[PDB]
Amino acid sequence: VYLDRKLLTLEDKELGSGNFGTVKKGYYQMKKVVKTVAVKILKPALKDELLAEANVMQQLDNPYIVRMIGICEAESWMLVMEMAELGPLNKYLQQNRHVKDKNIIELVHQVSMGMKYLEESNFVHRDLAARNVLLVTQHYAKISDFGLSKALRADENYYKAQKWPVKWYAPECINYYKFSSKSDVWSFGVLMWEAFSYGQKPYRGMKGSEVTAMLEKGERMGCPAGCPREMYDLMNLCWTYDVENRPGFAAVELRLRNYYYDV
Numbered sequence: 001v002y003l004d005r006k007l008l009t010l011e012d013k014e015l016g017s018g019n020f021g022t023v024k025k026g027y028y029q030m031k032k033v034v035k036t037v038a039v040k041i042l043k044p045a046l047k048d049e050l051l052a053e054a055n056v057m058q059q060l061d062n063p064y065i066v067r068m069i070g071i072c073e074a075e076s077w078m079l080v081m082e083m084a085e086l087g088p089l090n091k092y093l094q095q096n097r098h099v100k101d102k103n104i105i106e107l108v109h110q111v112s113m114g115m116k117y118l119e120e121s122n123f124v125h126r127d128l129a130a131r132n133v134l135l136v137t138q139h140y141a142k143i144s145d146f147g148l149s150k151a152l153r154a155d156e157n158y159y160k161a162q163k164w165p166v167k168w169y170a171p172e173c174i175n176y177y178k179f180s181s182k183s184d185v186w187s188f189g190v191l192m193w194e195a196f197s198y199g200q201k202p203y204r205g206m207k208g209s210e211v212t213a214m215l216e217k218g219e220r221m222g223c224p225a226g227c228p229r230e231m232y233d234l235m236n237l238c239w240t241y242d243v244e245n246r247p248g249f250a251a252v253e254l255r256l257r258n259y260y261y262d263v
């Protein structure tokens with residue numbers, strides 16, 4: 001699973017940035033052809049997180065999850081993934097306002113199919129958000145950034161923690177530090193919110209502690225100008241306060257599969 005630095009070229013246009021360091025476009029010389037890749041380049045432990053991300057990515061084989069080519073012990077540590085060229089789903093819709101809405105259903109479904117796969121595989125993402133949905137084509141998205149993910153113990157249905165996208169986290173993650181596919185389901189509702197908001201941030205202006213209060217009050221995000229009906233009704237079901245009543249991806253994909261067909 002290790003790669004030859006010499007076989008890898010990096011364009012200077014940094015693709016983006018995060019705590020680990022930067023991500024650059026690059027090209028990796030394969031058997032015979034070259035592959036366009038996106039490469040996480042690691043700038044005091046971030047390493048372990050990165051290899052954790054690669055470990056997870058290494059066991060995932062599914063059409064709606066970004067594929068990892070390998071790792072490169074080169075100048076810095078590098079995680080090389082197959083390139084999703086259109087990039088993050090939020091930034092994209094932020095400047096493709098006039099994208100149909102029926103196109104979005106098909107997209108969030110794919111997300112849910114990838115997320116089902118992840119549920120069944122008993123892995124929890126823990127950072128599910130539109131920004132982590134990468135576009136291959138305008139009609140093909142994949143889930144990325146498994147830096148927080150965890151493989152679940154065979155004996156439990158949740159991971160328990162000992163810096164958080166609070167606005168994407170379910171109440172139980174915040175109250176008890178408990179992360180399950182159901183928590184990912186909550187996030188998937190915030191993701192759907194974003195998508196159907198053509199990339200608007202959720203809970204605009206609010207602080208985490210204030211988002212936390214609003215949800216406990218039984219309040220949820222308003223419907224985004226233009227969203228269909230069931231899609232908002234799906235969001236609210238995803239945002240079920242009680243874990244055990246909240247639908248799993250098995251369920252949420254199932255409904256998702258249909259609704260689209262009828263559009």
Ligand SMILES: c1cn2cc(-c3ccc4cn[nH]c4c3)nc(Nc3ccc(N4CCOCC4)cc3)c2n1
Nearest residue numbers: 015016017018023038081082083084085086087088
């Ligand atoms: C496969 C795995 N990937 C990971 C990341 C990526 C980029 C930045 C960050 C920051 N934290 N994690 C990241 C992952 N980005 C990928 N592709 C991608 C494609 C296009 C852009 N854009 C195009 C528009 O202008 C801004 C940059 C951008 C990206 C991609 N394809």
